[PDB]
Structure 1
Amino acid sequence: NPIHDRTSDYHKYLKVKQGDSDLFKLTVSDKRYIWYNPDPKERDSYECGEIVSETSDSFTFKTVDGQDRQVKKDDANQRNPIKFDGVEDMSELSYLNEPAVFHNLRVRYNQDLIYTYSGLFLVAVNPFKRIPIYTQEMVDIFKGRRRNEVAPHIFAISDVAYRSMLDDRQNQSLLITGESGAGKTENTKKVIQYLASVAGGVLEQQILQANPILEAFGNAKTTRNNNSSRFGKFIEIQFNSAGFISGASIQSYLLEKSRVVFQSETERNYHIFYQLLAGATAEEKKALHLAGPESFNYLNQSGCVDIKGVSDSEEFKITRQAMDIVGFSQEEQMSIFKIIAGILHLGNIKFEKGAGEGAVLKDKTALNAASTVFGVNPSVLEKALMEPRILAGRDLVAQHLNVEKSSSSRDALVKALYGRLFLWLVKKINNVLCQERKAYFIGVLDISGFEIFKVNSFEQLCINYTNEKLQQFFNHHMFKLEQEEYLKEKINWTFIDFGLDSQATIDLIDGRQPPGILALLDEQSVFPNATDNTLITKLHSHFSKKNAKYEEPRFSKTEFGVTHYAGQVMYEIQDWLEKNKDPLQQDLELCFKDSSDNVVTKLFNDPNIASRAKKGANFITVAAQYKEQLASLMATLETTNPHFVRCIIPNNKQLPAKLEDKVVLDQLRCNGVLEGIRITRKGFPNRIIY
């Protein structure tokens, strides 16, 4: 049994290594220690001092510099006896405080033990390096083993959820939290690998091949993650009454399609673009009129076209192979790349001013190239771009857009093409994975993590609000409902205020009465004369000096701050109305509806992809679509028994072996980890009726 064999990889990679006789001597010591702040200004930088004396209400200890300080016992962060250093479940620590919890994670992290239990939930610190703990041999070890019988691991919590699904005949859910780059997507994959194995000969393989496809079109390099998921997703692993995998369903959420036409410095567009250009055959390059990434406006503005340690040519091959195993016709696959190539050409179209204010198109090389691969008439497309037709009452009037507006319309077409292609890809995949009515399922949530950039827009607000909601879901299940049970069954429990509540922030963003940020956003979206300026003025009017989670900065007139659980974020109001309205000239849709290409035709004719719901007189806004998907997720989660995994980023440099206290402690605090451990200790978790 590898579990009890100190020579097995299991012991080598999942257990804390045996300490020596020298460590043993320190472990049996009678001395007592305390964690203190050498600098009262740097509260997260701790040192270990020895307690030399005490009074009825205080300790006197020695600092590293051989000095002496005193502290009241009530404010003291005592250090746990070192026999606890490396403990697998921190609910066991005698002293539960920030430096103690951080120290234990540090001790384990220093030995590449990234998983640690914090009572009922799992904590996972991103190693930013490969660790051999995800092999089939590792999967077999955890199979059917109780949590307390094996080391902490993403596989263990997956197995527990699986057993609970069978033991209770209840749908389960794995909620993996974390800011951008913390490890959510990596762990999500592990969960699926493990379940596919223990409950699994072709379906399971296709289920696995679904990710590399989604990531190529849905992931991209941002300043916080080289493989940032730019769309969130809820994955349903479906099982039959017997407990066998009967299928899988992928619920994808809104994609950051604005990235296709713009990327901040040092970031990249979606991976696929680089994979195609770098992995396409010499013939494909001629047929699609491809060239180097530096040749395309949509790829040569960030100053970055490659990711260290990543081969786009090699990744392309993996994507293609994934597309094959899932079942994408060689025809479909080619159309997909034509769309990708077409998008690139569209981005190269340079509009110029004519004799008048209207724009003209002198060079038509790119226009012609795009029309070619897309299978649409270039003259038509050209007219639909610079001279779209609209109704002026009931009259049909041909517009003549200037350079700026022509460019924006061109970007709108691009974003719609990509966003729809993504929906199409997910749809196709679900057809293959969905072929049997399920009896149960385990849902794995992998949303885009909390993120902050120099410039935060509408997308970031929605992303961070999602993270705000998931954290509230954790607070609710861990603290609210927990104590609600105690007081319901009344076991002489006095309510405890854990101080974790994101309701105020949530109300500020999605509140109905009074109306929140999104509500006002939509309101301004229908107001015929509204501008981004009138929008922010409206927001300031409602929340400046009125909502404690809102801030009207004195240093800017185009930004507003929102205090999230993970920190305050300043949002730039530029383009919010257009992003929310998400317009597209009908003449462009008519142009592509007549495309000779099958995939393209499907993207503009398939209602469930091309159609857009109407909020009465206007088309449903993106904020409205957002709210709908969120509500849908929350409702689903309510029909499941949740399991939480808290992913923790070690630093902000994507470097291994570099655990920074400040970075880690802020996450431990806003995640409610210690409070989570305290409720498990002070309360009564498991309880069965008579």
Structure 2
Amino acid sequence: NPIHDRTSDYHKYLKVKQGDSDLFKLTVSDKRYIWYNPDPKERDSYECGEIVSETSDSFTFKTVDGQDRQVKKDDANQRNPIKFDGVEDMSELSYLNEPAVFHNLRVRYNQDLIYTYSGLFLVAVNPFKRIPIYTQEMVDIFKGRRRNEVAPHIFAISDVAYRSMLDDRQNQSLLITGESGAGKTENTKKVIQYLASVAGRGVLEQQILQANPILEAFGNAKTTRNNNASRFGKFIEIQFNSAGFISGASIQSYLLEKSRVVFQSETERNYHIFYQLLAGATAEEKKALHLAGPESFNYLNQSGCVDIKGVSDSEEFKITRQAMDIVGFSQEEQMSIFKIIAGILHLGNIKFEKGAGEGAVLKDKTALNAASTVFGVNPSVLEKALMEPRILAGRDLVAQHLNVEKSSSSRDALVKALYGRLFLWLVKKINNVLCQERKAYFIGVLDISGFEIFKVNSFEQLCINYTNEKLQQFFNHHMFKLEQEEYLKEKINWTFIDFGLDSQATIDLIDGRQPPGILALLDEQSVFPNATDNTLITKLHSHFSKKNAKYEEPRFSKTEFGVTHYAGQVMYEIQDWLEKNKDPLQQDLELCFKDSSDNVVTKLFNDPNIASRAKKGANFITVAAQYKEQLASLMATLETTNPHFVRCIIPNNKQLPAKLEDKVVLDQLRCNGVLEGIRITRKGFPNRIIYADDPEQYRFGITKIFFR
């Protein structure tokens, strides 16, 4: 039994190491200790001080340099007896305070124990290095074990949800939270791994796992926060039959950050797939697609970074191609996929310049021709569609002649639409393959793009961060609000506790209905024919400045507004919001591509599930309305499941192992509600059954007995 055998890999990598006689002496000491701030300005840097005396309301303790200070007992953060250091579930701590919780995660992390319970949910602190705890033999150990029978692990909460699904006949969800780079995506993959192994009886299982490298190659990119940042969110339904065997899966994908295809900030990359193609293509792929190196392509040569530390793009391309094979994409489908990737790189190299008059011309047609060739479209039709698109003016049909900037933006709009529709097509193709059985039950794993702050935050960052704020609201509603409403509806002598975490004011600012929040005002300005980015920001300032406590009109800029999110204030730059929200694409460009000789390109443009834009009145649904609809669908789905939460925690902002930064971590423990979440578990009454069915508590409700 590896659990009990101190020499096992399980003990070695998932259990706290045996302490020594030196540590035993320290563990039986009668001394008592306190966590204090050497520097009072610096509330998250703590040292340990010995308590040397006390009065009825105070402690005097020594400082590290030896001096002595005094603190009111009411303000004191006591250090737990050290026997608690490394404890597996923090609800067991005698003293529950910020530096003690952090210290416990510190002890575990220092020994590469990244998983720790904090009551009913799991905390996972990213190691930023590989740790051998996800092998088949680890899986085998966890299979079927109750949570208190085994060490903290993502496998354990996965097993717990899987047994609840069987035992209760109820759909489950695993909600993995965290800011960008914290570990959501990696933990999500472990959940799927685990569920596929323990509920497996095996092609379908391979196809479920091989979905991932395809989605990541096209949907992930290096940002300044994560070398493998998810730029789309997803909810993965793992499907089971009444017997509990896996019977299929379905991937709900959420809006992709398609602006990254045409622009990346300094040090960032475009989507991985562009680098994988250029590094891994054969000699004949490269010639047939007219490819060169990333440096030759405007969409890859602007950020100054074309490589990621520790990643071989040609190796990843082999893995993406093998995943495509396993999932079932044909050889011609694959070649079409790569033609669309190459063609986008060619479109980006088109250089418009100013003609005799205001209208643009194309004097060098090399990149236009190369694109047209791989796309299987007519280069004259394409050129005309870029620079002289036809529109209605009243009912008249009028050929425009766009200037360089407008031609360039239309070219960029076409590229983003090609790439976003290709992505949707990939997901649709994958799903039809995994759609093999009607499900009896599902466990849904949610992996959103995590909370993110850049030097410049745009409309995509606001939607990301709102998603994160809603997810945090959901944790709060499940841990605190619904928990206490149950106590109240049952009358068990409970005084309501204000846990002081309420995202509602920030949610209403962003998405409120009356008064209108930011998104409703954005939609308003989006169908107002005279609107500009500047009238938009003036309208936000007029509604919220010095009226809404979560909004700030900054004095240092006329083009930014601040939103105080649960995870910190973010300043958003309003430039391009109206164009991003309307997401226009000239119809003459669609007509050009509907005519493509390529079977995949033709689907992207003729298949209404892919090509069609929904309507509202006589305007295309805006991106904000599409955002809202996706989020409201997710929230509706989660409400039909029993949720389990895993809070991923980033150790620092440099993507380095062995470097836990106190301020970085504590900010997350605070805005995640981790200590509040531990307290509700300690102070409350987690279990309750309609009557039927030594010691003390225990509580009798109007229809249930509740026990702590």
SS of the equivalent of 1:109 reads helix
- 1:462-482 deviation digits (Å, cap 9, x = unpaired): 000000000000000000000
Superposed, which structure 2 residues align to 1:44-123 within 5 Å? 44-123=44-123
Q: Distance in 2 between matches of 1:27 and 1:610?
A: 67
Q: Distance in 2 between matches of 1:25 and 1:374?
A: 74
Q: Distance in 1 between matches of 2:303 and 2:397?
A: 41
Q: Distance in 1 between matches of 2:538 and 2:277?
A: 44
1:134 Cα deviation (Å)? 0.2
- 1:321-370 deviation digits (Å, cap 9, x = unpaired): 00000000000000000000000000000000001000000000000000
Q: Distance in 2 between matches of 1:567 and 1:67?
A: 36
Q: Distance in 2 between matches of 1:521 and 1:594?
A: 35
| Structure 1 position 172 matched with structure 2 position 168 | no
1:597 Cα deviation (Å)? 0.1
- 1:586-632 deviation digits (Å, cap 9, x = unpaired): 00000000000000000000000000100111000000000000000
TM-score (norm 2): 0.97
| Structure 1 position 501 matched with structure 2 position 502 | yes
Q: Distance in 2 between matches of 1:38 and 1:299?
A: 48
1:634 Cα deviation (Å)? 0.1
- 1:535-576 deviation digits (Å, cap 9, x = unpaired): 000000000000000000000000000000000000000000
Q: Distance in 2 between matches of 1:498 and 1:392?
A: 58
Q: Distance in 2 between matches of 1:442 and 1:598?
A: 35
SS of the equivalent of 1:166 reads helix
- 1:271-324 deviation digits (Å, cap 9, x = unpaired): 000000000000100000000000000000000000010000000000000000
1:519 maps to which residue? 520
Q: Distance in 1 between matches of 2:325 and 2:687?
A: 47
Q: Distance in 2 between matches of 1:424 and 1:362?
A: 34
1:687 Cα deviation (Å)? 1.6
1:26 Cα deviation (Å)? 0.2
- 1:129-148 deviation digits (Å, cap 9, x = unpaired): 00000000000000000100
SS of the equivalent of 1:74 reads helix
1:67 Cα deviation (Å)? 1.0
SS of the equivalent of 1:656 reads coil
Q: Distance in 2 between matches of 1:106 and 1:334?
A: 49
1:2 maps to which residue? 2
Q: Distance in 1 between matches of 2:435 and 2:82?
A: 51
SS of the equivalent of 1:688 reads strand
Deviates more, 1:230-239 or 1:56-65: 56-65
SS of the equivalent of 2:613 reads coil
Percent of residue pairs bearing the same amino acid type: 100
Q: Distance in 1 between matches of 2:556 and 2:144?
A: 58
Q: Distance in 1 between matches of 2:87 and 2:260?
A: 43
1:13 Cα deviation (Å)? 0.1
Q: Distance in 2 between matches of 1:73 and 1:119?
A: 26
SS of the equivalent of 1:568 reads strand
- 1:24-51 deviation digits (Å, cap 9, x = unpaired): 0000000000000000001000000000
Q: Distance in 2 between matches of 1:346 and 1:688?
A: 64
Q: Distance in 2 between matches of 1:614 and 1:435?
A: 32
Q: Distance in 2 between matches of 1:482 and 1:661?
A: 31
1:66 Cα deviation (Å)? 1.1
SS of the equivalent of 2:689 reads coil
2:162 maps to which residue? 162
SS of the equivalent of 2:138 reads helix
SS of the equivalent of 2:226 reads coil
SS of the equivalent of 2:75 reads coil
Q: Distance in 2 between matches of 1:258 and 1:688?
A: 52
Q: Distance in 1 between matches of 2:615 and 2:192?
A: 37
1:7 Cα deviation (Å)? 0.2
1:504 Cα deviation (Å)? 0.1
Deviates more, 1:657-666 or 1:485-494: 485-494
1:266 Cα deviation (Å)? 0.2
Q: Distance in 2 between matches of 1:684 and 1:238?
A: 32
Structure 2: runs of 5 or more not aligned: 691-708
- 1:48-76 deviation digits (Å, cap 9, x = unpaired): 00001110111111111111100000000
Q: Distance in 2 between matches of 1:454 and 1:625?
A: 26
Superposed, which structure 2 residues align to 1:478-627 within 5 Å? 478-627=479-628
- 1:647-689 deviation digits (Å, cap 9, x = unpaired): 0000000000000000000000000000000000000112222
SS of the equivalent of 1:583 reads coil
Q: Distance in 2 between matches of 1:306 and 1:527?
A: 43
- 1:126-176 deviation digits (Å, cap 9, x = unpaired): 000000000000000000001000000000000000000000000000000
Q: Distance in 1 between matches of 2:448 and 2:501?
A: 21
2:702 maps to which residue? none
1:490 Cα deviation (Å)? 1.2
Q: Distance in 2 between matches of 1:167 and 1:70?
A: 54
| Structure 1 position 686 matched with structure 2 position 687 | yes
Q: Distance in 2 between matches of 1:486 and 1:566?
A: 29
Q: Distance in 2 between matches of 1:580 and 1:172?
A: 34
- 1:435-488 deviation digits (Å, cap 9, x = unpaired): 100000000000000000000000000000000000000000000000011111
1:489 Cα deviation (Å)? 1.1
- 1:164-196 deviation digits (Å, cap 9, x = unpaired): 000000000000000000000000000000000
Question: Cα RMSD (Å) of the superposition?
Answer: 0.3
1:658 maps to which residue? 659
1:86 Cα deviation (Å)? 0.1
Q: Distance in 2 between matches of 1:181 and 1:66?
A: 39
1:97 Cα deviation (Å)? 0.0
1:644 Cα deviation (Å)? 0.2
1:430 Cα deviation (Å)? 0.2
Q: Distance in 1 between matches of 2:554 and 2:562?
A: 7
| Structure 1 position 334 matched with structure 2 position 322 | no
1:350 maps to which residue? 351
Q: Distance in 2 between matches of 1:237 and 1:74?
A: 49
Structure 1: runs of 5 or more not aligned: none
Q: Distance in 1 between matches of 2:441 and 2:374?
A: 44
Q: Distance in 2 between matches of 1:686 and 1:158?
A: 20
2:267 maps to which residue? 266
SS of the equivalent of 2:247 reads strand
Q: Distance in 1 between matches of 2:196 and 2:390?
A: 52
Q: Distance in 1 between matches of 2:61 and 2:687?
A: 40
SS of the equivalent of 2:635 reads helix
SS of the equivalent of 1:416 reads helix
- 1:62-112 deviation digits (Å, cap 9, x = unpaired): 111111100000000000000000000000000000000000000000000
Q: Distance in 2 between matches of 1:408 and 1:497?
A: 50
SS of the equivalent of 1:687 reads strand
TM-score (norm 1): 1.00
1:230 maps to which residue? 231
Q: Distance in 2 between matches of 1:524 and 1:666?
A: 36
1:380 Cα deviation (Å)? 0.3
Q: Distance in 1 between matches of 2:94 and 2:67?
A: 27
2:183 maps to which residue? 183
1:216 Cα deviation (Å)? 0.1
